[PDB]
Amino acid sequence: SWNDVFQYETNKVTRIQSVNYGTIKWILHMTVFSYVSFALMSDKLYQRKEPLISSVHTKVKGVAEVTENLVHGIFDTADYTLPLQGNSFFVMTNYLKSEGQEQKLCPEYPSRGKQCHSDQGCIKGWMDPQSKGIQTGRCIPYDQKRKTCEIFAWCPAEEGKEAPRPALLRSAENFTVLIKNNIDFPGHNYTTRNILPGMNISCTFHKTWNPQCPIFRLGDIFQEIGENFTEVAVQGGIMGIEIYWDCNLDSWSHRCQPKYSFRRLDDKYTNESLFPGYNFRYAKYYKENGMEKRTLIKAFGVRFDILVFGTGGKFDIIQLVVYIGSTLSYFGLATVCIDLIINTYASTCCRSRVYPSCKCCEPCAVNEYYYRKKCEPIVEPKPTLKYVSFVDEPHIWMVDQQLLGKSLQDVKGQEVPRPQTDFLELSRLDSPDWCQCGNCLPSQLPENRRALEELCCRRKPGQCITTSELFSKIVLSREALQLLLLYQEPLLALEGEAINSKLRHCAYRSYATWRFVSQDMADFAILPSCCRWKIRKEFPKTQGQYSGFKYPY
Amino acid sequence: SWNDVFQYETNKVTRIQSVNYGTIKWILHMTVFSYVSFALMSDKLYQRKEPLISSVHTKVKGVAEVTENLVHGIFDTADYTLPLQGNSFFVMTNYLKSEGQEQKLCPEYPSRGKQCHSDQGCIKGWMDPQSKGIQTGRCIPYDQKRKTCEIFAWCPAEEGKEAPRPALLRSAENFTVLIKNNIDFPGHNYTTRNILPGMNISCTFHKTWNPQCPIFRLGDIFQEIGENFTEVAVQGGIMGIEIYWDCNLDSWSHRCQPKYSFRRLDDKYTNESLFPGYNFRYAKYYKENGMEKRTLIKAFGVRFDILVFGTGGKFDIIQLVVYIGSTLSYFGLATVCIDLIINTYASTCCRSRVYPSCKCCEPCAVNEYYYRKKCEPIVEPKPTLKYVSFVDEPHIWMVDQQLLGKSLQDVKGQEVPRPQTDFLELSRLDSPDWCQCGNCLPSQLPENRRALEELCCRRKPGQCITTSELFSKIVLSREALQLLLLYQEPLLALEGEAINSKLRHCAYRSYATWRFVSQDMADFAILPSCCRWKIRKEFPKTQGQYSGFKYPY
Amino acid sequence: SWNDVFQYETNKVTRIQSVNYGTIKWILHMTVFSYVSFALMSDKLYQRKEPLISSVHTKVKGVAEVTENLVHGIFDTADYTLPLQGNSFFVMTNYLKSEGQEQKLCPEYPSRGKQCHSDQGCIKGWMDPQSKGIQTGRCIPYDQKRKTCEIFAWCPAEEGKEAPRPALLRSAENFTVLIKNNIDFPGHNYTTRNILPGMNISCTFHKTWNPQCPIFRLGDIFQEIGENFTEVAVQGGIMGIEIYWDCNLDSWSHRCQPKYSFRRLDDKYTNESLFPGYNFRYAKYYKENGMEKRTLIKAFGVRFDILVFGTGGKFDIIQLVVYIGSTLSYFGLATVCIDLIINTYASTCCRSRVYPSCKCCEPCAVNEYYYRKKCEPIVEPKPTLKYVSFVDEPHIWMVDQQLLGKSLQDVKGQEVPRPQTDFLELSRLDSPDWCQCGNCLPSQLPENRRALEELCCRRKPGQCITTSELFSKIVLSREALQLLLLYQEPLLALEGEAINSKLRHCAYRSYATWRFVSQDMADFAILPSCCRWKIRKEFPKTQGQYSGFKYPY
Numbered sequence A, B, C: 001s002w003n004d005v006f007q008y009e010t011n012k013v014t015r016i017q018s019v020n021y022g023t024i025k026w027i028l029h030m031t032v033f034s035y036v037s038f039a040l041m042s043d044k045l046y047q048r049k050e051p052l053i054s055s056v057h058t059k060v061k062g063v064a065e066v067t068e069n070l071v072h073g074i075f076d077t078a079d080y081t082l083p084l085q086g087n088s089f090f091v092m093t094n095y096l097k098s099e100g101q102e103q104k105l106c107p108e109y110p111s112r113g114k115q116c117h118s119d120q121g122c123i124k125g126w127m128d129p130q131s132k133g134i135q136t137g138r139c140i141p142y143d144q145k146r147k148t149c150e151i152f153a154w155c156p157a158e159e160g161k162e163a164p165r166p167a168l169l170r171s172a173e174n175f176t177v178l179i180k181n182n183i184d185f186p187g188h189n190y191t192t193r194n195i196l197p198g199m200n201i202s203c204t205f206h207k208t209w210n211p212q213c214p215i216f217r218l219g220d221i222f223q224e225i226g227e228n229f230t231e232v233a234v235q236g237g238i239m240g241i242e243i244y245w246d247c248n249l250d251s252w253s254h255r256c257q258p259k260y261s262f263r264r265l266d267d268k269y270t271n272e273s274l275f276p277g278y279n280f281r282y283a284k285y286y287k288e289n290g291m292e293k294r295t296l297i298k299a300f301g302v303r304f305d306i307l308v309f310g311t312g313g314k315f316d317i318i319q320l321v322v323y324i325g326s327t328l329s330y331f332g333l334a335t336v337c338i339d340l341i342i343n344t345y346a347s348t349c350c351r352s353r354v355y356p357s358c359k360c361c362e363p364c365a366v367n368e369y370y371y372r373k374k375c376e377p378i379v380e381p382k383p384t385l386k387y388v389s390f391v392d393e394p395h396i397w398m399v400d401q402q403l404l405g406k407s408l409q410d411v412k413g414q415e416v417p418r419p420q421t422d423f424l425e426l427s428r429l430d431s432p433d434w435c436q437c438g439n440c441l442p443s444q445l446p447e448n449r450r451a452l453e454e455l456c457c458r459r460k461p462g463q464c465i466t467t468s469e470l471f472s473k474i475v476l477s478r479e480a481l482q483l484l485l486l487y488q489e490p491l492l493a494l495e496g497e498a499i500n501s502k503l504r505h506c507a508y509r510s511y512a513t514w515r516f517v518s519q520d521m522a523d524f525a526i527l528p529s530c531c532r533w534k535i536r537k538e539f540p541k542t543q544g545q546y547s548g549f550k551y552p553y
């Protein structure tokens, strides 16, 4: 089967020289091409994108002078507050220091209504989880009007004390942080950094003037997003410094720069029971005067979380191939649309309701010509298929249903048009109850299938089709049938009953071709009893029943 | 070439009114549509998904009362153990404290068999990397039966001492951690948090009852995954609190909630040489009695790593377009399947082996009618192409191969069927060694290509095709040929040898059309010597050799 | 419309038994299949890939003996330097210690030219942001030739002092770090770790010998990437330990192993004003002799950032379906290419310029036969469409344009070939100024549209087509026209003016079919005045004007 391999199939097509259809086709093609190209370029769907891996190294620089009372102290954001310099860092903005605490008995701080109306109110032997002090069951006069429960704990106890207002280290808004960010795209084998040779050092970040300076003033960070540093400093907070890397690693469009943005990460309206702000407690234990003491510091501040995210794209051929394959089927849109137009306007419904109503749609009736040049309807050749023609009608009846002992003459079928004959070929030129022509005869077939041949040439009384001279010229012309037989077999022998059978079949074939036109219908046609029996009379059989119609398949 | 632009191509098609094929087509279309729709909806392939950036802020709350001996102490997880409150946090569950250590000489702890069988066993001047103590070469009687090597180091040395069992801070399983998680999808410009207004505060996380409370009891964290906190507390561990954000940012299906899950991250069965658990050593140096001392604490505990991951989807038109384009080609499945059925059942092999064996497959022989209505086979018109017809055979022979001095009569070729003639058109109606008809003549062509015309009308002896009256009516009927010529050229001049050549060509064309049927074969047909020379005799040439068959292309 | 549902469309095709085209088709199909398969397998486009979530637990092991002067001390990387063991860790490689500092007056260190040329140079009451010391306005003689400004600060002040060279803790290159890495793919529900049972413990990482040992010597880490640990130790740095997980979670191809790589993350050539290296300052405050003192340590070292990244793939049916759908349209490449070849080589331009120039391209002229068997050109049947035939020419003229009072005879039109007549069907066989035949008559139509019928049988003077006997046999043969009418309607009545109209129309139809061939052109043909008026004379009308050509649609 070598020839089976070497076959090539190509579809049969129909050019149409239509201005409208060609214009529509090209418009739709340009539209699809424009959109797919735009999507590819905008979304960079030709690039295989990779996420980055990041390293952050921060350096906070600030000295705050505090007058605590009176002692003038300096708070350097180099050793006092910054042992961690990386993704996240903390800048202290307030503190509550309790110097020289001794484990002894003292009143508890009156926080959130922590007081007593009577001595018996306090519970002996139970330590409050907030004050973290063991109650002795007595109530001390903490203040003149703010007496609180007696407790044995570190004293003077300050647990529950509110953060000082205004914040002690407000000057922290004047501090600066230098962020060094190293990224890599391991798949693309590309690494870069946010500081490059030839960058200003005295610069400070501004979203317009200095959008690439990695030195940030904290107050500016807060102002850029409408946050009040003075208020946030009191209880603390969490702020995000987002670094976005939208990086194009293609040589012809290379661009890998960071974009800095800011976002408050703590909730401003956190409920008082969910620990608003940001703080931590750390203690330093020291023995003074032979008595173990402890210095406790509750520090409030802003934790800055540096969030680095982004992707790096580089041209990938496989991605482009996949995208093109995905978008290729969209170029059949023109075909789909124009074929749908042809099919819709080829209907007989439009000439009856649409065009009469709208006369601007009349010239869209050429779709009927475009649809006959495009489609060839055919029917399933099932055994029950039969075609019927009546000389008193202009069209043909297809009886695909079975005859339940009912004469074929009395069967509705379904009307179909007679095919237009090839004019070029022709340019070279007592009776039964179901019979209206009077020339039909009872069928000799077995009673069960006798109704197939119970057909007449016409539906109303009149002259039989056999009376026409064309019937004799075509169907009963022994000369013409012999010529057709010789055309099929030039050396045919004109002797015996074989020739009489060959001529009878040719007469049937001739009537069916003459009155059904297409071979598709001529194959399943049914001859009337009149024509059938005239043919048989003029081409008899030596002996035996005529088989009648036999299923072609 | 404006008309070239305005062309529209549409494929020629063939409707088939088949219940089976239409049903199959629609079933396959519904199947493909259902699957593509289901995939789109389930996988959300219309959504452009983005990973999140996260910030975590934790607050551990717990006081553990320890009776160390006797002194009753409190271990507050606010200052003693928690200066870091973010992605990861540590809860101490055990400790080994060595108070008031002095750099002097003392025995080494007997850990992992660290002992001596003799004084000379110990190495002088060498410091063990485990005990971290410089050996003096002597062995001290550390214990009555556990003497160990003498060392100069911090003393009393406790290096290698096992973690106390049961864990001192078992009460840490009753501690609670509040996790505040802020996420953002920077591309989608969406941010949310795990705590929202109107949430219960007294709640504690339960996977069913309170699946959204971000307050977790550590013992519950361990119980939920079948881990024993009491055992893990002895040597420590690492536990993961996974926060999954499967977030849909579309308005009509908006859902962005966290799902909390837990996973032990350290290996339970870590080898003793790979440092099982989690611990760290930290020292506090202080001068006591004028002698520099050091307090060493080895802390065992559980490090909790909060792992936040997830994606946020939002409708993207480009993604939907790409998905639809990818899935469009699957709607040709019905076409592929039904065309394959037609092709397979159109074979002549099925009527010979399949249908006789299986009679339920007989009604699938209409595929032969569907395949003749669908396909038009053609052959490459190469110069070696020739077609041959023998009046004693019912079919035709295509000789695509070359004649190597061998008469065309004696060439196998390959059998092809004679086309069915258009019955509608016809309804209007001494000898050489290779000659079996006796009426053929030697070819006058040059010897090299003389074998082309060495053909007879039949393969077996018999009457020549020329003897039929149809040959004279069609081929030798000067009247008919003149009528055909006039049809082609109405004003043709019937004079000179030009008319005699025009008639000879028409006679050849007529024989070829009559005996090959299709113009495709009639073009490459080969006339027998008998017919050829009868035609030439009745349409002679004034002078010169007859050219013979000439390649149409 | 049940039959409307049960329709199946199949395209009409044309097999071609061509070795070249079949070979090209199969080559292109194999090429496309090979590439799509290769892309699928290489890129694993059948796998839905997921990023990992990671946990890292490190254990650094090293003791460095330092001789500070003389006191011999040990620096253990277990308690002195490592409280953090996770994603990032710090190994100290150098330090500057200032023991027993007292807040008093002293000279400032001469760093970066920090000196005075005169006492008045120093500013009173202003504290330098670098030295962090309040100036008293005087200049102390710090050194014999390096006098610096007087300042009140912690003393002896060492701010700005350069890091010692060579680094004190060079022995840190001999330290080892054990990295335990736990990953998970939450979607795939897969977790693994970098240490598995049966792994060597005494091993140390080597890229070839021990590529999976998670124990790393720091000096080896630096040597592997061409970094000098001795130099980096002086000022410090940041090094990355990248752990890549390319993990295949499919059972038949399961592989999930880590690949370790190293990358310096700090910039080697950082500007001196951008704080090169890595360091931090931490202080320990202690009261000595009743005077508050502070010990300051500036530590230089290398921060190691463990960067874990990777994806885990597992077979997904939806991904495979999407990929196949995307790549399906590429299998029409053979069709596109071969159809383009057929179209290009079917042009009449190739036979005139290409083949004469290049004779190796002659056998590609069969594409003209392949293109006539494949395409059926048609024209839009618009009202202005007209076809014209002149008996003195071999081809046909299509006049699609309007006649602006200009005789149709004098219209250029555009030449088209006359269709090849179905030879099988035929094998069964005083004057106006615009008239060249002399037998045409003035048109009786209204003057506005009178020019349509102003056509002659020929373009040059000569005999009229009507003079041919074929005109009388075909067009004026009342017998033949009656036979055609009877063929259409066998029981037609031959009486009245109706028959005379039926015959006149048939004569028009016969001329148009005889001289235009295709019904497409015969429909829009235009008869000459000579033939038209001869037909009308021999088939007159009782009374009334002849309507003339009427638009078929």
Ligand SMILES: O=S(=O)(O)c1ccc(Nc2ccc(C(c3ccc(Nc4ccc(S(=O)(=O)O)cc4)cc3)c3ccc(Nc4ccc(S(=O)(=O)O)cc4)cc3)cc2)cc1
Binding pocket: A080, A081, A082, A083, A084, A088, A089, A090, A092, A095, A097, A280, A281, A282, A283, A297, A299, A303, B079, B080, B083, B084, B085, B086, B087, B088, B282, B283, B284
């Ligand atoms: O992302 S997150 O994870 O959330 C995250 C988490 C944390 C950070 N950064 C960060 C950096 C430093 C500290 C820290 C600290 C301490 C003091 C100040 N300022 C100060 C105030 C007043 C005075 S005063 O007026 O002169 O007094 C002097 C100085 C600023 C910061 C800190 C240090 C030590 C400890 N604990 C400890 C426990 C036991 C022992 S021991 O001795 O027993 O061994 C010793 C120490 C706790 C905190 C905390 C967080 C960033 C991100």
Ligand SMILES: O=S(=O)(O)c1ccc(Nc2ccc(C(c3ccc(Nc4ccc(S(=O)(=O)O)cc4)cc3)c3ccc(Nc4ccc(S(=O)(=O)O)cc4)cc3)cc2)cc1
Binding pocket: B080, B081, B082, B083, B084, B088, B089, B090, B092, B095, B097, B280, B281, B282, B283, B297, B299, B303, C079, C080, C083, C084, C085, C086, C087, C088, C282, C283, C284
């Ligand atoms: O993700 S990871 O990266 O893996 C990661 C890593 C770490 C964490 N959290 C975390 C939080 C705190 C500590 C820490 C600590 C200390 C003590 C207790 N409890 C305690 C026990 C007994 C007694 S007692 O009985 O009363 O005695 C009292 C208290 C709990 C925790 C800690 C603090 C300081 C140091 N070092 C240091 C070095 C030099 C100097 S200096 O003075 O020389 O300057 C001062 C201090 C080390 C550890 C460690 C880790 C989370 C995640």
Ligand SMILES: O=S(=O)(O)c1ccc(Nc2ccc(C(c3ccc(Nc4ccc(S(=O)(=O)O)cc4)cc3)c3ccc(Nc4ccc(S(=O)(=O)O)cc4)cc3)cc2)cc1
Binding pocket: A079, A080, A083, A084, A085, A086, A087, A088, A282, A283, A284, C080, C081, C082, C083, C084, C088, C089, C090, C092, C095, C097, C280, C281, C282, C283, C297, C299, C303
């Ligand atoms: O990714 S990143 O975020 O960038 C990142 C960030 C950090 C890390 N690791 C890391 C680990 C430890 C330290 C640390 C430290 C201290 C000392 C040595 N060696 C040493 C030298 C000389 C001598 S000597 O010669 O014997 O003297 C003895 C020992 C090594 C490391 C450190 C400890 C404490 C503090 N601060 C503090 C503040 C207030 C108070 S308080 O008392 O006031 O409460 C107490 C303490 C700061 C640093 C720093 C970073 C990894 C990654």
Ligand SMILES: Nc1nc2c(ncn2[C@@H]2O[C@H](COP(=O)(O)OP(=O)(O)O)[C@@H](O)[C@H]2O)c(=O)[nH]1
Binding pocket: A501, A504, A505, A508, A512, A522, A523, A524, A525, A526, A527, A528, A541, A544, A545, A546, A547, A548, A549, A550, A551
């Ligand atoms: N289309 C069509 N074909 C028919 C009809 N009647 C007979 N035939 C065909 O013509 C042949 C004639 O068979 P027939 O002469 O009746 O039986 P016979 O005596 O054995 O030759 C059969 O093989 C049928 O296929 C008819 O009414 N319509």
Ligand SMILES: Nc1nc2c(ncn2[C@@H]2O[C@H](COP(=O)(O)OP(=O)(O)O)[C@@H](O)[C@H]2O)c(=O)[nH]1
Binding pocket: B501, B504, B505, B508, B512, B522, B523, B524, B525, B526, B527, B528, B541, B544, B545, B546, B547, B548, B549, B550, B551
């Ligand atoms: N198909 C076919 N065509 C033929 C055959 N012989 C001749 N022809 C064609 O008919 C024409 C007749 O040429 P011929 O009369 O032999 O040469 P002439 O004397 O120059 O006219 C040639 O152009 C051929 O194309 C034949 O055997 N088969």
Ligand SMILES: Nc1nc2c(ncn2[C@@H]2O[C@H](COP(=O)(O)OP(=O)(O)O)[C@@H](O)[C@H]2O)c(=O)[nH]1
Binding pocket: C501, C504, C505, C508, C512, C522, C523, C524, C525, C526, C527, C528, C541, C544, C545, C546, C547, C548, C549, C550, C551
């Ligand atoms: N193709 C073509 N058709 C024509 C021409 N002239 C007339 N016809 C057609 O033939 C029919 C003859 O109409 P005609 O006899 O002139 O008008 P009548 O007197 O009303 O019958 C019309 O319906 C036209 O469709 C012509 O020149 N070319």
Ligand SMILES: *[C@@H]1O[C@H](CO)[C@@H](O)[C@H](O)[C@H]1NC(C)=O
Binding pocket: A170, A171, A172, A173, A174
């Ligand atoms: C920040 O600095 C400016 C200029 O030095 C000063 O005017 C302002 O008061 C400072 N802010 C704080 C909060 O100290």
Ligand SMILES: *[C@@H]1O[C@H](CO)[C@@H](O)[C@H](O)[C@H]1NC(C)=O
Binding pocket: A228, A229, A230, A231, A232
């Ligand atoms: C910010 O907060 C402070 C105190 O918290 C307040 O005095 C001030 O009005 C607020 N707004 C601005 C713009 O400073």
Ligand SMILES: *[C@@H]1O[C@H](CO)[C@@H](O)[C@H](O)[C@H]1NC(C)=O
Binding pocket: A270, A271, A272, A273, B201, B202
């Ligand atoms: C805080 O929560 C309590 C209940 O725990 C509720 O009564 C109160 O209204 C809440 N306040 C805010 C500001 O959310």
Ligand SMILES: *[C@@H]1O[C@H](CO)[C@@H](O)[C@H](O)[C@H]1NC(C)=O
Binding pocket: B170, B171, B172, B173, B174
């Ligand atoms: C946890 O708390 C419950 C109730 O307060 C108590 O019964 C239990 O013993 C506690 N567990 C530990 C380990 O202390």
Ligand SMILES: *[C@@H]1O[C@H](CO)[C@@H](O)[C@H](O)[C@H]1NC(C)=O
Binding pocket: B228, B229, B230, B231, B232
């Ligand atoms: C857990 O561990 C402890 C000691 O490690 C042991 O007594 C107990 O049986 C274990 N199981 C449970 C369920 O507590």
Ligand SMILES: *[C@@H]1O[C@H](CO)[C@@H](O)[C@H](O)[C@H]1NC(C)=O
Binding pocket: B270, B271, B272, B273, C200, C201, C202
């Ligand atoms: C630990 O590793 C040692 C070898 O270093 C081996 O002999 C021993 O069996 C291992 N034990 C476990 C529990 O893995």
Ligand SMILES: *[C@@H]1O[C@H](CO)[C@@H](O)[C@H](O)[C@H]1NC(C)=O
Binding pocket: C170, C171, C172, C173, C174
């Ligand atoms: C590292 O160890 C080797 C062998 O113990 C030694 O030769 C080398 O000097 C050491 N390096 C340093 C910097 O101490």
Ligand SMILES: *[C@@H]1O[C@H](CO)[C@@H](O)[C@H](O)[C@H]1NC(C)=O
Binding pocket: C200, C201, C202, C203, C204, C210
């Ligand atoms: C692997 O382990 C064996 C003992 O189990 C040890 O002898 C060998 O040295 C180890 N491999 C290396 C490279 O040290």
Ligand SMILES: *[C@@H]1O[C@H](CO)[C@@H](O)[C@H](O)[C@H]1NC(C)=O
Binding pocket: C228, C229, C230, C231, C232
């Ligand atoms: C590394 O640096 C040291 C001092 O920084 C220098 O002596 C040495 O030549 C450098 N190169 C190597 C290979 O050690």
Ligand SMILES: *[C@@H]1O[C@H](CO)[C@@H](O)[C@H](O)[C@H]1NC(C)=O
Binding pocket: A200, A201, A202, C270, C271, C272, C273
């Ligand atoms: C550092 O920056 C300064 C300007 O701030 C410039 O003058 C100097 O040349 C730079 N040096 C290097 C090594 O980049």
